[PDB]
Design a protein around this ligand. Structure first.
Ligand code: P5Q
Ligand code: P5Q
Ligand code: CL
Ligand code: CL
Lengths: 9, 236, 236, 9
């Protein structure tokens, strides 16, 4: 299950 | 802090440089220094703060999962005793992860959230608060695991209430909040039906609002809708 | 150091765990503690030391290159003044990289190399010494850049002399030493013809010795021969 | 130009 990756602005 | 002597604008500039260099620990320290200047954060600055700490804690969570899996295998039937080392090192990584989460939660509590009046900023910070309590919940086992879970739920719920009142159903912050809250329901709260229902309702209400969007906003919203769809495909 | 209270065997065990968790800073600190116990390192332990620091300095070199490229663009004709931040942050990363290289070189000098009597250990450590002076040379600009380059050359040359006397031409340490020494010639010493000649002679002499090897040793040697071939394809 | 990757034991 994937949350928001949010690792690149 | 160590960043007290650097200009706010320089901290922001160096946080952007650190992202380009994939130096996310530095990026997080720079953005922590920027927050501690005491001024509110712009939309772009909030994203820099989030990206920095998401990468830092993302590496710690990945390492914790590797070590927790090794530890669980060592405590099975037929496993040879290897000593305290696996547990000790998992605890070390776990403690470092909890320290990062506490640092982020401290920034939100002192004083980002109380000064955030617009829906865009307030929902963003409350989503962050839910996320980092969720990461604490992933490793929690003791007297406070239930309170950590409820702290995550409470922050997500307040963010959801505001976003439903103040944002269109396609707003990317609203969509990412619902995505992560659904992951909370599935992975943390043992409520897979609530997770599936939230993901479905979020997706369908966004679909019906896409006609109002520009080409660029359409791309932003449909990207996150696909993440909701990916989870539903995995969960059903 | 901070590892003085942990058992040597536990440090080695945790270094292996840190590699699995991709926690290379931890891995390097664990292996530094193991070295500082004062006993010589086994073949496997030498590899753990090398892998840990290669990953740490590899991340720093990648970041330094990103920042150095940004810095050079800012100092071109028509570039807008952005202030001291790019230079300052490149210097910070550069200083951290130099500290790691100095730490590794200090471990080799106190006292890994002087206690290394077998060709396998001595060539391994001298190759390491050449590598980390090479990394120092990549960022050097001042009064000592030539001395750093000669320190790299001298360590590589001693390792080469021993490996040609004591190891077969297919030995993976001998092959990797020649590969990196050829990269030194091409990238650091401005001697591309020496780099090409060394890579070619190393490849051809290994090819002629492959018939002596087992299936598993053949796989090890041909892998590094392909890296020599890749460089020759790029250089010619 | 590639040196020994040497990032996996
Ligand atoms: C929490 C969150 C929501 C949405 C996004 N995002 C990604 N691309 C556009 N918007 C990031 C983080
Ligand atoms: C310096 C060096 C030489 C060779 C190897 N290697 C890789 N696979 C087998 N041997 C690693 C490092
Ligand atoms: Cl530990
Ligand atoms: Cl800096």
């Amino acid at each position: 299950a994937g949350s928001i990756p949010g690792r690149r602005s | 802090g160590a960043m007290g002597s650097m200009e706010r604008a320089s901290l922001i500039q160096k946080a952007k440089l650190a992202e380009q260099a994939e130096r996310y620990e530095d990026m997080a320290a720079f953005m922590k220094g920027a927050v501690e200047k005491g001024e509110e954060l712009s939309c772009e600055e909030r994203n820099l703060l989030s990206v920095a700490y998401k990468n830092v804690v993302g590496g710690q969570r990945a390492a914790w999962r590797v070590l927790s899996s090794i530890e669980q295998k060592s405590n099975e039937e037929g496993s040879e005793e290897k000593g305290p080392e696996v547990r000790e090192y998992r605890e070390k990584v776990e403690t470092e992860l909890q320290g990062v989460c506490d640092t982020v939660l401290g920034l939100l509590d002192s004083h980002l959230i109380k000064e955030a009046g617009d829906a865009e900023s307030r929902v963003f910070y409350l989503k962050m608060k839910g996320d980092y309590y969720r990461y604490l919940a992933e490793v929690a086992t003791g007297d406070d695991k239930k309170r950590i879970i409820d702290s995550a739920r409470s922050a997500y719920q307040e963010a959801m209430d505001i976003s439903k009142k103040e944002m269109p159903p396609t707003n990317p912050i609203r969509l990412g909040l619902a995505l992560n809250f659904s992951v909370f329901h599935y992975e943390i709260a043992n409520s897979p039906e609530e997770a599936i229902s939230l993901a479905k309702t979020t997706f369908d209400e966004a679909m019906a609002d896409l006609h109002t969007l520009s080409e660029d906003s359409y791309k932003d919203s449909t990207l996150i809708m696909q993440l909701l769809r990916d989870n539903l495909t995995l969960w059903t």
